[PDB]
Design a protein around this ligand. Structure first.
Ligand SMILES: CCCCCCCCCC(=O)SCCNC(=O)CCNC(=O)[C@H](O)C(C)(C)COP(=O)(O)OP(=O)(O)OC[C@H]1O[C@@H](n2cnc3c(N)ncnc32)[C@H](O)[C@@H]1OP(=O)(O)O
Length: 323
């Protein structure tokens, strides 16, 4: 197939042409793409904590190279475009575009098939790096979380956070308890660990947070000794000191943010670039009228009150030294 024919068949916008040309030149992977099917697929989906409803739909809709040639062409090359950067955190996280939902369940779940086809490659990388199986699996379970999030956010099955799953699938991100850590480098090339907080797993309890922080250096120094990070960095809505106006002392965010050293400038009050982040993480916002959003928690109340007041939320950046 030719990349223009693929683009047109799948309903992809003209701006995706450059990506598809790149994928055309890259070509099919040396290891042919294999999707698990039937109970094999159900077993893997369940290991990845994908909800039963979604898993059943994913297995039912799995595409076929003969009936779905354009989608299959893209599946092979998208998988290839990820595994070519296995272990490489310097590569940008390019998972490819979302497919228009006019292509049905195969299109909606496209990046889930990408993830399933890539599990064997990343598990091999985990083994080569000596990563314990339980860490490898715990890391990959965010697929189920992100599937679940799609359904909450939009109302039908899907997974449109494929940019983020490139980290898991390249073996550059690991969940070590409540927190995730990714191999990362600053602009001057200095190694650090990027810290992230997956939604599933309950509140960010101080004891769970501290336990994750204690695991970070031992884990990376054992399996990625060439990296040598001494610091964790984070950029997040939850590092915004404005939260202190609204959250109480019993808030986990308030207690733990006090350990962080913020390194960006106090943002301009009128800068609205951080509103979308907090609305995504608190509400999985999809453009609904602000006063239709729930108001059951202190944070839900805070986000809306602050925005109603004409004020803005800002992503802030900081670090903590690794124990
Ligand atoms: C702060 C130290 C760490 C700094 C790390 C910065 C780098 C992080 C880079 C990233 O990963 S940005 C994305 C971060 N991840 C998310 O936002 C995932 C979705 N969010 C969550 O699941 C929770 O917000 C989280 C587990 C992170 C924290 O929940 P907690 O319950 O521990 O937070 P906290 O104790 O401060 O909550 C105060 C109140 O807000 C409520 N709340 C917290 N998160 C909420 C939420 N996401 N949606 C609705 N309510 C929420 C919480 O229930 C409680 O309600 P009440 O006061 O009414 O009892």
């Amino acid at each position: 197939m030719d990349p223009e024919t693929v683009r047109i068949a799948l309903g992809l916008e003209e701006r995706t042409a450059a990506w598809l040309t790149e994928l055309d030149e890259l070509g099919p992977p040396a290891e042919p793409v294999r999707l698990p099917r039937g109970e094999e697929a159900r077993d893997l989906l369940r290991r990845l904590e994908v909800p039963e409803l979604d898993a059943e739909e994913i297995v039912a809709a799995a595409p076929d190279p003969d009936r779905d040639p354009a989608l299959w062409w893209l599946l092979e090359r998208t998988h290839h475009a990820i595994v070519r950067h296995m272990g490489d955190h310097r590569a940008k996280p390019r998972g490819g575009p979302p497919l228009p939902y006019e292509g049905g369940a195969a299109a909606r779940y496209f990046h889930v098939y990408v993830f399933l086809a890539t599990v064997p490659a990343v598990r091999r990388f985990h083994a080569e790096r000596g990563i314990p199986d339980e860490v490898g699996w715990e890391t990959l379970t965010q697929l189920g979380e992100l599937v679940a999030i799609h359904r909450r956010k939009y109302g039908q099955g899907g997974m449109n956070m494929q940019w983020w799953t490139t980290y898991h699938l390249r073996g550059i991100l690991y969940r070590l308890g409540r927190l995730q850590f990714s191999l990362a480098t600053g602009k001057d090339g200095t190694p650090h660990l990027g810290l992230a907080v997956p939604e599933w797993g309950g509140p960010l309890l101080p004891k769970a947070y501290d336990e994750s922080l204690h695991r970070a250096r031992p884990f990376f120094d054992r399996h990625f000794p060439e990296h040598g990070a001494r610091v964790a960095w984070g950029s997040s809505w939850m590092l915004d000191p404005q939260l202190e106006e609204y959250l109480t002392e019993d808030s986990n965010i308030i207690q733990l943010a006090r350990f962080w050293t913020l390194t960006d400038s106090a943002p301009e009050p009128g800068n609205a670039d951080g509103d979308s982040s907090i609305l995504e993480f608190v509400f999985r916002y999809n453009g609904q009228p602000l006063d239709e959003l729930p108001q059951r928690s202190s944070l839900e109340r805070a986000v809306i009150a602050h925005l109603k007041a004409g004020r803005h939320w800002h992503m802030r950046t900081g670090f903590v030294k690794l124990p």
